[PDB]
């Protein structure tokens, strides 16, 4: 388990959740959102050594493999295992609309 | 849609499914399987430029983002999307057992 509760609380060198703030206007040009002005949809990065939160048997077997054949270029990558929504507030004309965007924020990570 | 049916018929440079044969003993040290002697579990490799098989909205945002700020080092990764099972044959004492290991082979890939 490599989530906010652990990744943030430490200084992990390998696969972990990394904080990142994205401003709707400034970083996506989305001039349609009203609030927030942005959000913390993080990302993942860092090496995936043998047996590090392997996603599937595959992610495991490829793990052991790349461990012995470093120059074969098949090291499982670090990708979001958990994503959470992000309530937003945008206006449709002159009416408040409070919807919930899905798979917007990375809450934890794995080596797939 | 980056599947065998496509990544294998074109010499792709970006994210795509790469072929890989894993011999059970020589590569994994599993002196416990009878047949097969190995199998084609594949892997994924290669850059994930904006607009390239986005697993989620996040992957899209993280793609559209990392493009304008490669310096942050948050480019989404290439990871298995659809995985098929591999049946095997192993012996318990002398009784033969044919079981199907799940999530063992990669058929399609996405950028997460």
């Amino acid at each position, epitope marked *: 388990a490599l989530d906010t509760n652990y990744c943030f609380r430490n200084l992990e060198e390998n696969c972990c959740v990394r904080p990142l703030y994205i401003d709707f206007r400034q970083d996506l040009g989305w*001039k*349609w959102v009203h609030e927030p002005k942005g959000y913390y949809a993080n990302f993942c990065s860092g090496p995936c050594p043998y047996l590090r939160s392997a996603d599937t048997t595959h992610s495991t077997v490829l793990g052991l493999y790349n461990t012995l054949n470093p120059e074969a270029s098949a090291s499982p990558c670090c990708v979001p295992q958990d994503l959470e929504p992000l309530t937003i507030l945008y*206006y*449709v*004309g002159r009416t408040p609309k409070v919807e919930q965007l899905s798979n917007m924020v990375v809450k934890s990570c794995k080596c797939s | 849609a980056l599947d065998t049916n496509y990544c294998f018929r074109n010499l792709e440079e970006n994210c795509c499914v790469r072929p890989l044969y894993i011999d059970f003993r020589q590569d994994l040290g599993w002196k416990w399987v009878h047949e097969p002697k190995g199998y084609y579990a594949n892997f994924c490799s290669g850059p994930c430029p904006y*607009l390239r098989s986005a697993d989620t909205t996040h992957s899209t945002v993280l793609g559209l983002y990392n493009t304008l700020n490669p310096e942050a080092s948050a480019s989404p990764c290439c990871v298995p999307q659809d995985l098929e099972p591999l049946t095997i044959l192993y012996y318990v004492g002398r009784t033969p057992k044919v079981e199907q290991l799940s999530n063992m082979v990669v058929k399609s890939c996405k950028c997460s």
Partner: antibody, heavy 120, light 109 residues
Framework: QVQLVQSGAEVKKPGSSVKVSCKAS????????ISWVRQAPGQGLEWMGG????????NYAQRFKGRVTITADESTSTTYMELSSLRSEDTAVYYC?????????????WGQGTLVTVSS | ETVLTQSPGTLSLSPGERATLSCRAS???????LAWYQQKPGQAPRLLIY???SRAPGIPDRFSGSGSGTDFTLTISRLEPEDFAVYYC?????????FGQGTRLEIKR
């Protein structure tokens, strides 16, 4: 500067469905909500509905609340306006335009248009 | 649901005169939710004014909008020839977006 290129005109049989498309020049597709407005022969403009890119949430004018469908594909960097249960009345010029910023704003960038003719 | 009614139906004027189009909303619009477009025969609409009195990029100075609430007016001070066409008002204060029945400004000769 943003360019919008809709598909070419189309002739259709009543009861069938047409799928027009709008081509966006990449650097502005992900940051612009897109509306679709059609225009009947010698008639006024009718806002049909629209959609926000990436998040893929679209809203349609009640009039087409059940047969129009606007979607986007960032990869193809285009947005599709699929109208089914075609009627003769549906025959008109279907324009696709990007709003200034909000889901319901004025529209500054349009397409060339797309003549969808419904005839037997 | 929200009906815009432009007037006059047709406005024939000579090049140079001051053109004054109107648009009346069934409901109140804010000070910044109406718009003006011009349509040349066989062409997509061209955005002229948004909100109101807010000139869209690249639009000439002679094009000035104004108004609030229910009555809005678009005024072309010195009528050039590439100004005689069709003009529609659009509102975006309350879904659905809605245009006017249009106004035909043509050459008086």
């Amino acid at each position: 500067q943003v360019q919008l290129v809709q598909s070419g005109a189309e002739v259709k049989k009543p009861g069938s469905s047409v799928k027009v498309s709008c081509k966006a020049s990449g650097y502005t597709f992900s940051s612009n909500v897109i509306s679709w407005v059609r225009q009947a022969p010698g008639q006024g403009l009718e806002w049909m509905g629209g959609v926000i890119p990436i998040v893929d949430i679209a809203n349609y004018a009640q009039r087409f609340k059940g047969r129009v469908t606007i979607t986007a594909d960032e990869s193809t960097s285009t947005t599709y306006m699929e109208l089914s249960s075609l009627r003769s009345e549906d025959t008109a010029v279907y324009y696709c335009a990007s709003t200034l910023g909000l889901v319901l704003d004025a529209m500054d960038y349009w397409g060339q248009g797309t003549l969808v003719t419904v005839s037997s | 649901e929200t009906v815009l009614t432009q007037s006059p139906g047709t406005l024939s004027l000579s090049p140079g005169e001051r053109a004054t189009l109107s648009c009346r909303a069934s409901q109140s619009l804010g000070s910044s939710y109406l718009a003006w477009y011009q349509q040349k025969p066989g062409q997509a609409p061209r955005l002229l004014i948004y909100g109101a009195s807010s000139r869209a990029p690249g639009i000439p100075d002679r094009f000035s909008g104004s108004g609030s609430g229910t009555d809005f007016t678009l005024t072309i001070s010195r009528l050039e020839p590439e100004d005689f066409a069709v003009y529609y008002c659009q509102q975006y204060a309350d879904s659905p977006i809605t245009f006017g029945q249009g106004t035909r400004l043509e050459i008086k000769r």
